[PDB]
């Protein structure tokens, strides 16, 4: 179900060896993880191109503008800002709370 | 998925794009008339229905 | 698990003169008395209770002796609960094996009868 520490380590190494089109081979290494869960974990969180840094001022401005533009469409928005859609979503909610004060 | 190979010489790349386009036409036309045969009832083989579903 | 092996091997060879191996293995079992984990702690105590019936109460008392009055309670209560096991199982045989404690100023501690000479 949830992702342990050691499971993430196995998943990173296995993607580094087998690439990104063989999730059935990668699922065989883990315990009780299916191929779809492995893929989802990689793109959501474990991929190195995911940027886990603080938000710049520019990146926030684009967030607020695009969220006005296409409301609730975070998969469309998210590659324009270059964050994960979940990241974009929670940071939007952060700024909305902050503007409420 | 977009295919680019950065180093590759342009005679070789032109030849590859030529022959991939030829295979694509052969593939797609076969998809086109095997669907017609499946709809009219001419095929009875199940593996050709699976292959056409995949191509489609 | 090695202490469990010592317990069971100890009781099998009782009466057969294999005490040198068992005393050798006591030299390895005995530093594990300060372990605190309960599974390991009860395997060690089982090994010592097996060894009491194979190499005798005298050896087991000779091991305990120095720590029964040791300054730290840690060493002391572990040592006292080995002593009690020897005492329960072999209370009568220990009469011959106690050390000689000297008399202090107001209390007498020498067992004078054993000191009798015929």
């Amino acid at each position: 179900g949830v992702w342990r520490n050691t499971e993430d380590e196995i998943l990173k190494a296995a993607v580094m060896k087998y690439g990104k089109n063989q999730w059935s081979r990668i699922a065989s290494l883990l315990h009780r993880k299916s191929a779809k869960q492995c893929k989802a974990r990689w793109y959501e969180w474990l991929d190195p191109s995911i940027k886990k840094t603080e938000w710049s001022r520019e990146e926030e401005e684009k967030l607020l503008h695009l969220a006005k533009l296409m409301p609730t469409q975070w998969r469309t928005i998210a590659p324009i800002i270059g964050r994960t859609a979940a990241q974009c979503l929670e940071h939007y909610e952060f700024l909305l709370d902050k503007a409420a004060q | 998925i977009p295919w680019k190979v950065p180093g590759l010489p342009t005679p070789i790349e032109n030849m590859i794009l030529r022959y991939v386009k030829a295979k694509a036409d052969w593939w797609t036309n076969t998809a086109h008339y095997n669907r017609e045969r499946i709809r009219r009832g001419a095929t009875v083989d199940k593996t050709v229905c699976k292959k056409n579903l995949g191509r489609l | 698990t090695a202490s469990a092996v010592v317990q069971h091997m100890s009781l099998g060879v009782y009466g057969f003169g294999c005490e040198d191996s068992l005393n050798h293995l006591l030299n390895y079992v005995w530093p594990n008395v300060f372990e605190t984990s309960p599974h390991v702690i009860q395997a060690v105590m089982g090994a010592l209770e097996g060894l009491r019936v194979a190499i005798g109460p005298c050896r087991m008392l000779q091991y305990c002796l120095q720590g029964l009055f040791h300054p730290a309670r840690k060493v002391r209560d572990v040592y006292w609960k080995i002593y009690n096991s020897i005492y329960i199982g072999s209370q009568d045989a220990l009469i011959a094996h106690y050390p000689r404690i000297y008399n202090d100023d107001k209390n007498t501690y020498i067992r004078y009868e054993l000191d009798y000479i015929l």
């Binding site: - | - | 009781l11 209770e49 019936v53």
Partner: protein
């Protein structure tokens, strides 16, 4: 048992009653719980075979089907001399199992 630290023996002065073991407990030693080398017969104290309880299992308490023995190693260490070896409290493990099955079933 040796596997349950919270279980407690009766340890009263044992009598002429012979302790018995239910099918589940058949062939094992009452003290150290072993399957091999039976040396002596188990005697239970008067209170523990009072009345309806006459003839139940020593170790668990179910209908007894054969006699209980001490093993050879408990005889040599004279563990057979400590008292009535009837277990007098169910303990946490038995109780937990009941409530767990009853929750489910």
């Amino acid at each position: 048992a040796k596997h349950h630290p919270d279980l407690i023996f009766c340890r009263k002065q044992a009598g002429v009653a012979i302790g018995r073991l239910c099918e589940k407990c058949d062939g094992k030693c009452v003290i150290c719980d072993s399957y091999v080398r039976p040396c002596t017969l188990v005697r239970i104290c008067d209170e523990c075979n009072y009345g309806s309880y006459q003839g139940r299992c020593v170790i668990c308490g179910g209908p007894g089907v054969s006699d209980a023995y001490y093993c050879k190693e408990c005889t040599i260490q004279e563990k057979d001399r400590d008292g009535c070896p009837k277990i007098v409290n169910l303990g946490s493990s038995k109780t937990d199992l009941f409530y767990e099955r009853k929750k489910y079933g």
